[PDB]
């Protein structure tokens, strides 16, 4: 019942026995003498020349005695002050070609140095403020920034780091949550947050444990001084082979604390950053003392950034809603609304959304049903995420009532593509590359890398395994392209016009002349630059060849899965000729029975149609007739045709003109259960009236060009440049508050908000892109995880 030679033990003492571990303070279950024995502060955390070869005084926080190395409780600067050795930071970068570990080390250890609220742009303050962190950054592998997950909050991002899952999957969807199944709230006070029922996925410490790799406790009670956390990690590294963990985590509440008080641009931010660097200095001096400075892989990583947010910049729901007493709000840098009571009949989600939609000119939040949020946020598929969500503008709060100098000048939680929310990544050690810069990447990718660093098999996660192989000197995972599951058909012109009764009309009116205009020819070479997309699910689809485009037409969904076409820089935009306005032509390659019918579209009062290949970019008047084929048409709300018509008529030409040509792949997405995955036939909930033509929830486009823009898109030798979108197929433009104005004022704004990774589309379509390129597969995986942020 005491903490004698037990302080910060890795042992798990069950209740009611008093504990001496990292978390005993947080549980409030420590032994009476924990505070005196384990929270020693006597003489601080640094050796001085006077202390060198001192008699061991056990009341001292750390020791400068001759026995301290064998005991493994020397102050981190003992060798420097007493044995005339240099600080790690004062040493030149020396490449770590192989891990230099003591015999008995079966793998290089990993230390995750996690810093709360560390904005990417803090790194610009340089070696003046942070010499130790700047040496790690410059000697090791670093990204300009790392993208957090939404919401850009502490627990959701820390747990994403540990699991490689989106919050919707791992279950920590906020710092605050209500679970209707549990009928309980997740809060930070007391024992609730320790209940395992909240925590999904498989965190790194459990992955390690389950594969026979010992993990040190990632969590630290705030009571434990940072200096003690570093010494405790270093103590654990000195344990014998059978006890010594391979994976460790350090956590700092800084620079988050000061960020909230002073804001991210305050000169007061310098002192927190100096102290963080000092703590990093103690770790690296500590590792060098143990001769583990060329053995251990160190990850310096933040959970999220920090924005300027004052209490003056608060939207109040009481200015929109006639009854705010009938709702519960999760307030601040995001809004989540649910009904307060059940007896209450006044609450109605549709009325609330209407009341919160474009009511004030400068409105600093936007209401969404969670299924209508940008798909890149992946924030819908969890019963803990309220149906009604408010996306708050950066620098702003949303609160229920006015009554709810400011105390705070900094906050986070905003859209994860916001610059101020971006955080840091640095990898240093034998397994990371030497003096290497890598492109920015998403925090969901780190779990796979940390598994690779530790020789662990990752649990299933939202990382793209291989996409970060370019961070590592050595890779124990080689990615393999997935096997195509469905082989395409190549149907010839076979059906007579008399066989078609689709109720479609066109102003049309040499059989083998029709055929040669719809043969392979050079179509694939011109319009499919990166090879045919692979269909990774069981289905029946047809490859259709045209002068201007190639399509994979689904005989199940009665529309293309993808439409591929190349627009040269020099391409000319034409109109839809008046005589072809309402033209839809039967496709004599495809059975009447596996075609859409124009009768469906007339009976559906709310539903019109568009085309995947745009008639506007036809190579000739002749070729334009191919664009009006029933196999090129898709269901579109008149409201959405405004967006799509502008994209096709104006923006594709624009992108082609800016990027020295563009390859475009467009098609439908079905995600009615908003799980971010391709719907099966059963899961599709809307069809065109009196038909089996399924209505897409979204329309995607993948726009590819040469990264070397001095080479045209169709003659690119090296890396590719991609931007993609997943546009919500909405029957209104309520999302766009300026949609009253010309399309030039709002459509591109809407598209930028729904920017997507190629991976996002692959999940939502069951397609695999970029299968025929001159690029390594690991390079292609990085390309597929890229997001164009427009920030
Ligand atoms: C690498 C890694 C992963 C994981 C999952 C774990 C750790 N370690 C760790 N150790 C101690 C803590 C944490 N992680 C996270 N903890 C916080 C304490 C309580 N808390 C807050 O009041 C809090 C609320 C905020 N709202 N806006 N900003 C906030 C900052 C805060 F600290 C939680 C959010 C989490 C302590 C380390
Ligand atoms: C200072 C406070 C923030 C400390 C809070 C720590 C608390 C959230 C931690 C403590 C123990 C953690 C669980 C434990 O490691 C085991 C597992 C198994 C794993 O498969 C799922 C996660 C879970 C339940 C951990 C969740 C986080 C816990 C409760
Ligand atoms: C994220 O990963 C989990 C586990 O593999 C999976 O259940 C989920 O479908 C993934 N989400 C997306 C959008 O890929
Ligand atoms: Ca789905
Ligand atoms: Na109609
Ligand atoms: Na509008
Ligand atoms: Zn935080
Ligand atoms: Zn914070």
mmCIF file of N, CA and C and ligand atoms in Angstrom, residues 112 114 116 154-155 158-159 175 188 205 218-220 249 251 253 256 260 412, ligand 1:
data_model
loop_
_atom_site.group_PDB
_atom_site.id
_atom_site.type_symbol
_atom_site.label_atom_id
_atom_site.label_comp_id
_atom_site.label_asym_id
_atom_site.label_seq_id
_atom_site.Cartn_x
_atom_site.Cartn_y
_atom_site.Cartn_z
ATOM 1 N N UNK A 112 6.603 8.856 -29.625
ATOM 2 C CA UNK A 112 5.651 9.880 -30.147
ATOM 3 C C UNK A 112 5.661 11.062 -29.175
ATOM 4 N N UNK A 114 3.926 14.213 -28.713
ATOM 5 C CA UNK A 114 2.664 14.860 -29.149
ATOM 6 C C UNK A 114 2.499 16.203 -28.432
ATOM 7 N N UNK A 116 -0.145 19.505 -28.042
ATOM 8 C CA UNK A 116 -1.554 19.938 -28.224
ATOM 9 C C UNK A 116 -1.565 21.373 -28.770
ATOM 10 N N UNK A 154 -9.245 18.042 -29.694
ATOM 11 C CA UNK A 154 -8.120 17.343 -29.018
ATOM 12 C C UNK A 154 -8.283 15.818 -29.074
ATOM 13 N N UNK A 155 -9.339 15.267 -28.475
ATOM 14 C CA UNK A 155 -9.519 13.796 -28.334
ATOM 15 C C UNK A 155 -9.749 13.166 -29.708
ATOM 16 N N UNK A 158 -6.136 13.141 -31.357
ATOM 17 C CA UNK A 158 -5.195 12.261 -30.617
ATOM 18 C C UNK A 158 -5.544 10.800 -30.918
ATOM 19 N N UNK A 159 -6.834 10.452 -30.903
ATOM 20 C CA UNK A 159 -7.297 9.050 -31.071
ATOM 21 C C UNK A 159 -7.181 8.640 -32.544
ATOM 22 N N UNK A 175 -14.884 16.289 -28.228
ATOM 23 C CA UNK A 175 -14.468 16.347 -26.799
ATOM 24 C C UNK A 175 -15.725 16.162 -25.942
ATOM 25 N N UNK A 188 -15.355 15.238 -19.567
ATOM 26 C CA UNK A 188 -13.927 15.118 -19.167
ATOM 27 C C UNK A 188 -13.796 15.047 -17.637
ATOM 28 N N UNK A 205 -1.060 1.172 -28.998
ATOM 29 C CA UNK A 205 -0.589 0.463 -27.776
ATOM 30 C C UNK A 205 -1.230 -0.930 -27.687
ATOM 31 N N UNK A 218 0.668 5.772 -22.859
ATOM 32 C CA UNK A 218 0.623 6.978 -23.730
ATOM 33 C C UNK A 218 0.119 8.187 -22.933
ATOM 34 N N UNK A 219 -0.841 7.969 -22.029
ATOM 35 C CA UNK A 219 -1.518 9.039 -21.249
ATOM 36 C C UNK A 219 -0.676 9.423 -20.029
ATOM 37 N N UNK A 220 -0.737 10.706 -19.670
ATOM 38 C CA UNK A 220 -0.049 11.317 -18.506
ATOM 39 C C UNK A 220 -1.039 12.220 -17.776
ATOM 40 N N UNK A 249 4.809 7.333 -25.685
ATOM 41 C CA UNK A 249 4.197 8.633 -26.033
ATOM 42 C C UNK A 249 4.486 9.631 -24.915
ATOM 43 N N UNK A 251 3.015 13.653 -24.063
ATOM 44 C CA UNK A 251 1.953 14.645 -24.367
ATOM 45 C C UNK A 251 2.259 15.937 -23.609
ATOM 46 N N UNK A 253 0.241 19.749 -22.897
ATOM 47 C CA UNK A 253 -0.966 20.615 -22.992
ATOM 48 C C UNK A 253 -0.585 21.943 -23.664
ATOM 49 N N UNK A 256 -1.162 24.602 -26.668
ATOM 50 C CA UNK A 256 -2.644 24.751 -26.678
ATOM 51 C C UNK A 256 -3.096 25.777 -25.629
ATOM 52 N N UNK A 260 -5.056 29.456 -26.521
ATOM 53 C CA UNK A 260 -6.455 29.797 -26.142
ATOM 54 C C UNK A 260 -6.495 31.176 -25.473
ATOM 55 N N UNK A 412 -9.930 26.341 -31.788
ATOM 56 C CA UNK A 412 -9.835 25.377 -32.913
ATOM 57 C C UNK A 412 -11.083 24.493 -32.894
HETATM 58 C C1 LIG B 1 0.181 10.273 -28.797
HETATM 59 C C2 LIG B 1 -0.950 10.245 -27.800
HETATM 60 C C3 LIG B 1 -2.193 9.722 -28.134
HETATM 61 C C4 LIG B 1 -3.237 9.684 -27.215
HETATM 62 C C5 LIG B 1 -4.584 9.112 -27.585
HETATM 63 C C6 LIG B 1 -3.018 10.191 -25.936
HETATM 64 C C7 LIG B 1 -1.784 10.722 -25.573
HETATM 65 N N1 LIG B 1 -1.544 11.233 -24.277
HETATM 66 C C8 LIG B 1 -2.277 12.100 -23.542
HETATM 67 N N2 LIG B 1 -1.897 12.340 -22.269
HETATM 68 C C9 LIG B 1 -2.621 13.203 -21.544
HETATM 69 C C10 LIG B 1 -3.734 13.820 -22.123
HETATM 70 C C11 LIG B 1 -4.047 13.535 -23.397
HETATM 71 N N3 LIG B 1 -3.339 12.670 -24.133
HETATM 72 C C12 LIG B 1 -5.264 14.293 -23.840
HETATM 73 N N4 LIG B 1 -5.777 14.829 -22.564
HETATM 74 C C13 LIG B 1 -6.742 15.936 -22.566
HETATM 75 C C14 LIG B 1 -7.164 16.199 -21.123
HETATM 76 C C15 LIG B 1 -8.581 16.711 -21.004
HETATM 77 N N5 LIG B 1 -8.925 17.489 -22.192
HETATM 78 C C16 LIG B 1 -9.136 18.811 -22.039
HETATM 79 O O1 LIG B 1 -9.420 19.282 -20.942
HETATM 80 C C17 LIG B 1 -8.988 19.771 -23.184
HETATM 81 C C18 LIG B 1 -10.144 20.349 -23.705
HETATM 82 C C19 LIG B 1 -10.025 21.255 -24.758
HETATM 83 N N6 LIG B 1 -10.965 21.952 -25.488
HETATM 84 N N7 LIG B 1 -10.344 22.693 -26.365
HETATM 85 N N8 LIG B 1 -9.031 22.485 -26.225
HETATM 86 C C20 LIG B 1 -8.773 21.591 -25.239
HETATM 87 C C21 LIG B 1 -7.618 21.042 -24.694
HETATM 88 C C22 LIG B 1 -7.737 20.143 -23.656
HETATM 89 F F1 LIG B 1 -6.619 19.597 -23.134
HETATM 90 C C23 LIG B 1 -9.104 16.618 -23.374
HETATM 91 C C24 LIG B 1 -9.462 17.353 -24.660
HETATM 92 C C25 LIG B 1 -7.895 15.683 -23.542
HETATM 93 C C26 LIG B 1 -4.701 14.815 -21.549
HETATM 94 C C27 LIG B 1 -0.761 10.744 -26.514
#
